[PDB]
Design a protein around this ligand. Structure first.
Ligand SMILES: Nc1ncnc2c1ncn2[C@@H]1O[C@H](COP(=O)(O)OP(=O)(O)O)[C@@H](O)[C@H]1O
Ligand SMILES: Nc1ncnc2c1ncn2[C@@H]1O[C@H](COP(=O)(O)OP(=O)(O)O)[C@@H](O)[C@H]1O
Ligand SMILES: Nc1ncnc2c1ncn2[C@@H]1O[C@H](COP(=O)(O)OP(=O)(O)O)[C@@H](O)[C@H]1O
Ligand SMILES: Nc1ncnc2c1ncn2[C@@H]1O[C@H](COP(=O)(O)OP(=O)(O)O)[C@@H](O)[C@H]1O
Ligand SMILES: Nc1ncnc2c1ncn2[C@@H]1O[C@H](COP(=O)(O)OP(=O)(O)O)[C@@H](O)[C@H]1O
Ligand SMILES: Nc1ncnc2c1ncn2[C@@H]1O[C@H](COP(=O)(O)OP(=O)(O)O)[C@@H](O)[C@H]1O
Ligand SMILES: [Mg+2]
Ligand SMILES: [Mg+2]
Ligand SMILES: [Mg+2]
Ligand SMILES: [Mg+2]
Ligand SMILES: [Mg+2]
Ligand SMILES: [Mg+2]
Lengths: 288, 288, 288, 288, 288, 288
């Protein structure tokens, strides 16, 4: 919905957004939205996501697809009306994204998802990309483990000529919905096949916000299949745009740069990462 | 409708347009159209706006969508006939834009929306853009506050990987209609995802005029996701074209230029803005 | 229809075409076609024009849209057959353009629409364009007044972020049909939003001839939203092509060049225009 | 249909093709096909031509459109089967082009259409083009008169902002069919609006052969609306390709070059033309 | 179908393919498939070829189109199933290409179609192209005669502004099917209008193989209508790709180069051709 | 489905993936999935693959197309639900790829398909490409024989102007499904005609993973029909992307480089190949 502000309420909002990243307990936001989701009435649509065609499928709090749901409406504080209707396994009415309010008046944040190596990481979309054929896969997985911390991280595999990899876009989105609905730390191996169909385009556009709202982090690998020219710069551009945080390779081997958007209109941060390989290509991110 | 003129009536028109920006009390035009809107018969369509598909949805004076409305016509002074019909929540007949006359014979104006720091600002579409990754978001919000003055400004959020941001174009237009129907000062955070679908294209084309007619100002952020080359110049071009006023960054940090179209065939004005950051990235525009 | 010629009839045609611009009383052609139109049977389709989709709407001599009209045919001298049929507010049968013969055997002319400042001006399409952000709007209006002479000129407003401006293409064409059917001098403020949909493309293609045939002049503003490069030259090219006359800005401030096509295969003329601003940006074209 | 050859029959064919241009009486071929057409059964489809959409309309020997024609077939010498069927004013079955055999075994010719100034001219498509804004219209008309000789030439007007010009593609093709069915010399003023829709594309592809087969000549003006760069060379290229003969302007004023294809695999000829203007821009081609 | 191989069967295959070009009696393959075709049950579909739309028409051994054919299936050695069904004159089921097995286990060959001037020529698609406006038409016909030898060669005419030339793609494919079904040597004058519609694209893709399988040769003219730049090189590229043999012009007048693919994975051969003109542009290829 | 990991389970996965290529008995994975497939219930869909249109056809364990299959669902460990439904010979419900789990928890592998010349080769997609018109066909076949070892390799022929070659994309995919379902080593001669339709695009995207999952290797020829410029580098790029292993030609004649992806996030290997020709172009890869 839309929000109204004057100098005073605006200053309160910014402080709140600033706190959501800098002072809130890492992962607290995720815990909060988890509570919101489980309090939702059984059978209630909570998430709509677009499929390849452009239509969208709907899920409930248990990551189960909703096939039929008689039209229902809701009136917001803003005075706007939200309406949802699922028919024949497709959203007849409604919009893509979260179908229940997780944020409330607190919007425009990059909820702290985790803390590691002396740095706070934001939830939302995190694109790992840069100089082709580098160690992007090893890096997303190490990051997945580090940010998961005490928790296991979820892995969504898509579009790679390796065993067991799904290459059907509709299964892919189904995997993403389940992931964001049930896990704080998520890895998507190769966004290569997405970058275009309507559903695919919808994904670039919706994922970051969906994740940021849930308070989860989606760490996606994006190796520029394109040339080895300054075309990567265009990819890196289209990435800072659709991402909450960016992670790109550098001149120095094993080194990556992390560019984080800490929130709406807030300062963008940058810190470095040093990594090394161990047995069976398991990558480790040096902390201290 | 069309209007006829001879040297004398034309000179009267120009003086009137000139007055609408230079001498009218700031915000008076908004107040006037507000009165026109509330005098409208209950259930009467007042605004039609295109959705992604290209079809358009219709609203009444209370920003409530009209779903069914039996065909009805009206005969203008021009002799032309206006017809509106809504069926199944879509305009069966009519046109995009205001469905009731707010301007009358006084057209081609840039109604003064507010006065601040010794400068008058025009209503209509205001695009804030320029050298990528600058302080565009902080700037639209400060401007929102400044022009709102005694009033709160409305904020429409769209297409950013931040928490609570809607990424569905149809919700977006719904948010814009409600805003222009109820608030004089409006901020749209990121027009990035719009720039293309038919509805999106319709938006660039219709917004400025819809706002100018209402007498409200829509301050939209437009960070060129494109290259960091002279591609921004093309964006800045496509912006002077669809905007009533333009605000672009300069060589000097914190400094912006405001290019205003004061009205049909009237002189274009330019003045400078100096800004600075405070706590939690709240931007302040220096007045005196 | 098609016309046959031998050296002698051809010479008579050229003399007639030459006369239609050089010796006929300015505006006499308009008066003539007005008479032809009013003699048309009531309810008879006289003008068909394409809408955005590509379909076309039909009007009668009073600029009223025809919604239903049972198929009817006519046999020309050429032996060809003209057929018109309107159903559900759309041309089921027929062609775009004038649906009744206004020209007869006298075709390929640039009927003199007016005389001013010692120069004769042709009817048809007149595009005013050149070096971006110049005084194109002030210029079309001054021209509108000058060529209107004793008569008021009609103003069609479209696609500008100013108050009261229509931004819906279908209303636009409706405004153009009414204008050409009832006024000898017409101004279209901004063809910017047209230059593409089928209806829009149809417009560039049909307007000049429709106007030339009616004997009216359509003075359209065309500010190249494009770059500030030699892209304007391409616009200026696409303009000499679809126009009867061209008006472009020069190196010298306030000066414009008028390139006129005086008729089929006839000589193209060029003369200069000196202008200056007065109060409220009202432009004046210096005569003597 | 397809034809079989051995060295001997091939040599006979080439001699025949050579004769069709070099020794046959100018215009004899046209006379011959005229006889073939008038011997055709009444109501029999003889010519099919594509309209803008891609569908095609059918005509009889009197240039009257056929609206309904029950399926009918014919077996050729080749063993192939020709089938025609018209329903609802459109070819349900059949192909574009001549629907009755005018050529027989004698194909691949450029029938001499006329002789003038000591040169033989071929029937078929003749494109007049070159350096923009030159005297193309005056040139096609003089050529029309010269090649018409004792006969009047037919003039098809299309896509120019002049009075009486049709701008509807479907009327255009209707005009072309009637012309080729009834006149040996034809002028098409401006192919500018054709160069793209399916019908338009069909035209470039079919006209030359239709004309060559009939034994008539279609002299079309093609002023490159495009740049004033070496883009004209690309137009001149696309012209030698779809034309039987080419006529292009030179460095010298009033001078044109005529490049003629004398027949299948035969030598291409070139000769020069000197022209001058008289009263009312009537152009004259110097003979002796 | 698919074929299985080990080192030994593979070596047998290669020897067989090598034999099909180097030692088999020229034209023997054509004779063989002719026998296979005539042994086919009456009314049995034998060839399917795509029309402009993308659908395909079906023919029987006598080059007669099949309009209705009740679904029928066949089980191959490979275990795969072939199914054909024609309804309303279109392939409801089946695939493009030969509908009966002509090759068997012997695939990947370039059957020798003829011997002339001390060189063996392969069946399949032969594209004659190179430096624009050269003697391509004279060359395909001389080649047609030479390879036809004791037999007449068939000529398919398409897309040229000459008398009697078909310009309808559907008639064209109909002509090609009849040709390949009844003649060993075939000439297609101008593939210019094909190079794009689906049917046209299908043609480039299917012809070479259809011809190679039949054991006939299709000699097609392809004059690059494109620029006179290194764009011909791109055409020459797209030609080596879709052709069995390539024939291109050289620096020396009258000289051409013949690049032949002798078979699957086999060596590509090249030899030169010297030609000269006689009366009526009949070209002769010098043998001894 | 999605998989969850912590540092420990992740390390176990990587070791397992590493083992699938480095220590498992060559071809053991293929044998394993063969067992899984034959244990599948009769009539059960096991593989779905896209056809040109974009729809997909379904096969059972015997490579027989399924035409009708009443909707059926399955619940995975992940909690996700797999659903399949075939109607009118097309997948009404389901996804492209394997319809039964062959991998299980062991995903992201490059199963060793064979060992030869002291090197292990991975299953999945193998693209052979590089400097145009080289010995790509001889190379894929030698590789087919070498990797087949004790077994015969399967050969799928497509899009080449040679005898017996299928040029219909739908037959092609039918050939690929049968191959991957029944043979460990597969050769596809020319992917040239695929590189675009939806089905074709689906193929590039799905094949590698389908093969890797089955444990079979698809060796495809890809001669860049494109220029002879650095366009091949772009092809070589689009190839490393969709391939499990890459084989490209070098400066040295007969020499090729083999770039292998050994598994998810694992090290990429490179080794060289020396080859020579024998009789009838049979290529031999030098081992010792
Ligand atoms: N032990 C290692 N030492 C150095 N580099 C390694 C090691 N293990 C893996 N890599 C690199 O990690 C990458 C493998 O993961 P992959 O997903 O295929 O690559 P990418 O991130 O470029 O998409 C490769 O570029 C590979 O060369
Ligand atoms: N306190 C500050 N001092 C200097 N720059 C700031 C400060 N706070 C925010 N910014 C800048 O404001 C911008 C943040 O808002 P954001 O919307 O993400 O950027 P943009 O306007 O480029 O779209 C960033 O470019 C950030 O670097
Ligand atoms: N009094 C004036 N003196 C000089 N220039 C003026 C004056 N009044 C208006 N203009 C110019 O006229 C133009 C305003 O009309 P507008 O329609 O917005 O421009 P354009 O013709 O470039 O589309 C502007 O370029 C403005 O700078
Ligand atoms: N008497 C004349 N002397 C010199 N040029 C002339 C004369 N009459 C006409 N022209 C030229 O003939 C052309 C007019 O015909 P038009 O159809 O508009 O041009 P185009 O052939 O370039 O399409 C113009 O280029 C004009 O300048
Ligand atoms: N007797 C001849 N001497 C030299 N060239 C000739 C002779 N006869 C024909 N030609 C050339 O043969 C070609 C004619 O056949 P055509 O099909 O029109 O050409 P193309 O092969 O370029 O498509 C022309 O380029 C023409 O100049
Ligand atoms: N005996 C041989 N010696 C050298 N080169 C050969 C030999 N046999 C075949 N070749 C080469 O192998 C290739 C033939 O297979 P083909 O599929 O047509 O080529 P490509 O791999 O370029 O697609 C050709 O480039 C040919 O010149
Ligand atoms: Mg990766
Ligand atoms: Mg912003
Ligand atoms: Mg203007
Ligand atoms: Mg002309
Ligand atoms: Mg040719
Ligand atoms: Mg090959």
């Amino acid at each position: 919905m839309i929000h109204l502000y004057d100098a005073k309420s605006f200053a309160k909002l910014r402080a709140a957004q600033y706190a959501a990243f800098h002072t809130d307990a890492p992962g607290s936001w995720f815990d909060h939205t988890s509570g919101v989701l489980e309090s939702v009435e059984d059978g209630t649509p909570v998430l709509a996501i677009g499929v390849e065609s452009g239509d969208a499928i709907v899920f409930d709090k248990n990551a189960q697809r909703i096939v039929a749901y008689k039209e229902k409406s809701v009136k917001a504080e803003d005075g706007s009306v939200s309406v949802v209707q699922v028919e024949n396994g497709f959203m007849k009415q409604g919009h893509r994204g979260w179908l229940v309010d997780l944020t409330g008046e607190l919007v425009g944040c990059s909820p702290v998802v985790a803390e590691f190596g002396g740095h706070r990481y934001a939830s939302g979309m995190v694109i790992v990309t840069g100089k082709g054929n580098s160690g992007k896969t090893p890096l997303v997985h190490a990051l997945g483990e580090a940010l998961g911390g005490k928790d296991k991280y979820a892995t969504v595999r898509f579009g790679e000529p390796l065993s067991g990899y799904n290459t059907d876009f509709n299964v892919f989105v189904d995997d993403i919905a389940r992931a964001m609905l049930q896990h704080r730390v998520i890895v998507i191996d190769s966004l290569k096949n997405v970058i275009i169909s309507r559903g695919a385009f919808d994904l670039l556009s919706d994922i970051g916000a969906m994740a940021a709202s849930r308070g989860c982090v989606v760490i996606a690998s994006l190796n520029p299949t394109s040339n080895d020219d300054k075309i990567v710069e265009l990819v890196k551009e289209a990435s800072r745009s659709n991402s909450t945080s960016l992670v790109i390779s550098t001149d120095v081997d094993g080194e990556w740069q992390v560019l984080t958007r800490t929130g709406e209109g807030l300062q963008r941060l940058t810190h470095t990462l040093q990594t090394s390989y161990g047995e069976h290509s398991v990558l480790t991110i040096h902390t201290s």
